[PDB]
Design an enzyme around this catalytic site. Sequence first.
Site, PDB file in Angstrom:
ATOM      1  N   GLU A   1     -17.841  67.927  -7.101  1.00 22.38           N
ATOM      2  CA  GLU A   1     -17.926  66.673  -6.318  1.00 22.38           C
ATOM      3  C   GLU A   1     -18.913  65.684  -6.940  1.00 22.38           C
ATOM      4  O   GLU A   1     -19.752  65.114  -6.199  1.00 22.38           O
ATOM      5  CB  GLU A   1     -18.313  67.003  -4.871  1.00 22.38           C
ATOM      6  CG  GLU A   1     -17.362  67.968  -4.199  1.00 22.38           C
ATOM      7  CD  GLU A   1     -17.644  68.282  -2.747  1.00 22.38           C
ATOM      8  OE1 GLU A   1     -18.676  67.814  -2.223  1.00 22.38           O
ATOM      9  OE2 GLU A   1     -16.849  69.045  -2.161  1.00 22.38           O
TER      10      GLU A   1
ATOM     11  N   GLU B   1      -9.117  74.974  -2.685  1.00 22.69           N
ATOM     12  CA  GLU B   1      -9.641  75.027  -1.294  1.00 22.69           C
ATOM     13  C   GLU B   1      -8.589  74.561  -0.299  1.00 22.69           C
ATOM     14  O   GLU B   1      -8.963  73.876   0.648  1.00 22.69           O
ATOM     15  CB  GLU B   1     -10.938  74.224  -1.154  1.00 22.69           C
ATOM     16  CG  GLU B   1     -11.952  74.519  -2.249  1.00 22.69           C
ATOM     17  CD  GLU B   1     -13.316  73.851  -2.079  1.00 22.69           C
ATOM     18  OE1 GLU B   1     -13.579  73.326  -0.959  1.00 22.69           O
ATOM     19  OE2 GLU B   1     -14.114  73.872  -3.076  1.00 22.69           O
TER      20      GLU B   1
HETATM   21  C1  LIG Z   1     -15.420  73.898   0.544  1.00 20.69           C
HETATM   22  C2  LIG Z   1     -15.556  72.564   1.180  1.00 20.69           C
HETATM   23  C3  LIG Z   1     -16.769  72.683   2.054  1.00 20.69           C
HETATM   24  S1  LIG Z   1     -15.651  71.275  -0.054  1.00 20.69           S
HETATM   25  C4  LIG Z   1     -15.728  69.878   1.033  1.00 20.69           C
HETATM   26  O1  LIG Z   1     -14.852  68.765   0.807  1.00 20.69           O
HETATM   27  C5  LIG Z   1     -15.010  67.851   1.938  1.00 20.69           C
HETATM   28  C6  LIG Z   1     -13.944  66.754   2.007  1.00 20.69           C
HETATM   29  O2  LIG Z   1     -12.849  67.043   2.905  1.00 20.69           O
HETATM   30  C7  LIG Z   1     -16.406  67.230   1.943  1.00 20.69           C
HETATM   31  O3  LIG Z   1     -16.530  66.393   0.786  1.00 20.69           O
HETATM   32  C8  LIG Z   1     -17.487  68.271   1.887  1.00 20.69           C
HETATM   33  O4  LIG Z   1     -18.659  67.663   1.337  1.00 20.69           O
HETATM   34  C9  LIG Z   1     -17.169  69.397   0.919  1.00 20.69           C
HETATM   35  O5  LIG Z   1     -18.120  70.424   1.216  1.00 20.69           O
END
Ligand SMILES: CC(C)S[C@@H]1O[C@H](CO)[C@H](O)[C@H](O)[C@H]1O
Length: 335
Positions: free
Chosen positions: A137, A244
Amino acid sequence: QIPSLKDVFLQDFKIGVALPVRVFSNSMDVELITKHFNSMTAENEMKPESILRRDASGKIYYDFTVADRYIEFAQKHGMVVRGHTLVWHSQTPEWFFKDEKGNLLSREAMIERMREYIHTVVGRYRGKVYAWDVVNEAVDENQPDGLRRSLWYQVIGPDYIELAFKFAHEADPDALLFYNDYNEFFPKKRDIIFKLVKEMREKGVPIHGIGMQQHLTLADNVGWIDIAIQKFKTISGIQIHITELDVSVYKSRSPSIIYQTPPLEVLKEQAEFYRKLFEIYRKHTDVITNVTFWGLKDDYSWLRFFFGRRNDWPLLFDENYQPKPAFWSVIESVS
Ligand SMILES: CC(C)S[C@@H]1O[C@H](CO)[C@H](O)[C@H](O)[C@H]1O
């Protein structure tokens, strides 16, 4: 009696699951995990805040007692492990960027600290963790150079990203090293991720893959996801992990209508969504090598708390370990 996800997709990609460590001592969790999944990610247990410790003197040390359980389980059950994550603005203690007095480290000292961290963590699991989310990120489309102004950017500077990949590749030359991000199929962010990874590849940075988090809602345009994979796969030699995946039943992160139990029409819309998604993943099977879900079953989902405490049903298995309508629609993307 129901088909195994990992077997259905055997010729396409690994099928993975994000897991908190409590599941390894739950016989019903282990049954569902070992049937369907040939890849696992630690949901939190391999993030910096989960490993970094400081002793009474303020000296940094590493606690691997929980992370080690993932490799022990994976080896017992013949599963691969995605390492998540080495370098991130989140779930990393602010003291990691500072000396004993609470002042910011020098760039030199913080590069050394990052090198030791990555060498220690990647080195410990060398040959046992086949893929790492090295940087997570790092993109912010609101910034002039497209990079998030985290403590990594403030303390090291914009080369922190390429340095992290250098150090991870030193520690485990056989690991596949990924850049991981969310909203990865929104056009502005997609184009910044493309440019970042392509430019790093062109200067010989050891980055092997793009992690597409795929934190989706029923409001998302699956056509945008197809287009993003088409763009990313033009980077020669790059592979893609879906890292994810989940599909919120809501159409925003701040719904005004919250369900106690999900309407059947919403579960059918979700099954249609997941089917269209897996058709796109199979279309891009030449570049996608792992599809990981962010949770084992609906009641374990981060979506029940991260955006506010609420019920959500984002995955293929319900609270009672039963396949959902989306499970069958995903299977049918092959059959
Ligand atoms: C494994 C997840 C917590 S990653 C998740 O993506 C999200 C966007 O939907 C946010 O950016 C959170 O910051 C990030 O932790």
